[PDB]
Amino acid sequence: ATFEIVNRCSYTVWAAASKGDAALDAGGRQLNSGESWTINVEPGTNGGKIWARTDCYFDDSGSGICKTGDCGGLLRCKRFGRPPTTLAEFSLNQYGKDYIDISNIKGFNVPMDFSPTTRGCRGVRCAADIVGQCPAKLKAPGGGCNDACTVFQTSEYCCTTGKCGPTEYSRFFKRLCPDAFSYVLDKPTTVTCPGSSNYRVTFCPTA
Numbered sequence: 787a788t789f790e791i792v793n794r795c796s797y798t799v800w801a802a803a804s805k806g807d808a809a810l811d812a813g814g815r816q817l818n819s820g821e822s823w824t825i826n827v828e829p830g831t832n833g834g835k836i837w838a839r840t841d842c843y844f845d846d847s848g849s850g851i852c853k854t855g856d857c858g859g860l861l862r863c864k865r866f867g868r869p870p871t872t873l874a875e876f877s878l879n880q881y882g883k884d885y886i887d888i889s890n891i892k893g894f895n896v897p898m899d900f901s902p903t904t905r906g907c908r909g910v911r912c913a914a915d916i917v918g919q920c921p922a923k924l925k926a927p928g929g930g931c932n933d934a935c936t937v938f939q940t941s942e943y944c945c946t947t948g949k950c951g952p953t954e955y956s957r958f959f960k961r962l963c964p965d966a967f968s969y970v971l972d973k974p975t976t977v978t979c980p981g982s983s984n985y986r987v988t989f990c991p992t993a
Contacts, residue, residue: 787878788984790903791836793817795990798976799838799896800852802863803827810834813862816842817989829879829982836874838896840929854895869893870930872912872966874900874928874987881985884979888912889967890959894920895930899991900993907979913961913992921958933959945970 791801798818803810803825811825827834839855848861855867870893876886887910888900894916901909920931934955935944944951949971952960956969965975 787829787831787884787982788869789827789836790824790951790984791817791823791825791988792986792988793819793821793838793990794988794993795819795896796936797840799840799989800842800844800855800861801836801989802839802855802857802867803834803836804857804863804866804948805831805834806866807864809862809864810836811898813864814839814857814860816861821862827870827876827878832877832880834876834897835877836876836987837864837871838898839867839871840895854930855882855925869936870895870926870932872896872898874898876985877982882981884981885976886910886979886985887893887967887974888963888965888978890916890963891935891967891970892925892931893931893936894959894963897991898988899986901988903984903986904980906983907977910965910977911991912966913990914962916959916962919958919962921955924955924958929958943969 839852842852844850857863897913899911960968
C-alpha cells in the first residue's frame, strides 16, 4: 500500500511510521511546510502507526531529540513515539479488509486527517484546537495535550483490568474530536476499507 504523508502545517514536522518493532519504509523524515512524503507499506501489516513529531534536533547520524513523539532519539523510528502523539492507526489486508482510525489514546500534538485515496470508504479527522483547550493538568510543557493514562497512571485511565469507563479527561478529547478514540474502551470509530486501499495522512488539514 501507498501512503502519502503531507505536512500542511505552517511549521516543520518530523513524520514517523512504525509497527512497533520495526520501521515502516524509512521510518521517519523531516517535512517542511507543504512537503509530501510517499511511503510503501507491506500488505498484511498489522498495527502500523503514523504520527508527527515536533521541535526536533538531529545530528548528521540521525540521532537527537523531539519534544513530542520522540522514538528513542532516532530520526528513522523503529519503535513507537513518546506521548503526546495524535495517531493514525491501520491494519492492512485483514481477511480481505483494511481498518483505519485516528486515536487520542496517547494524547494529541498535531491535528490530522486520515483518508483513503482510492474508493470504497470514508476518511476520519481530528482537527480541533485540542492543545489550546487542553485541561491544565494534561498540558505537556514541550507542547501537546497528554492523555490521562500517561499523566496519572491509574487502572481506570489506562484500562488495565479491561474494565473502565469514560472519564472527565476522555470526554474532553471526545467532545473536540468525536471521530477519534478517546480511551481504550471507547465505542470504536474504526473505518473499514477495501483490502489494499491507498491513503493520505495530512497534518494540519484545515491550515
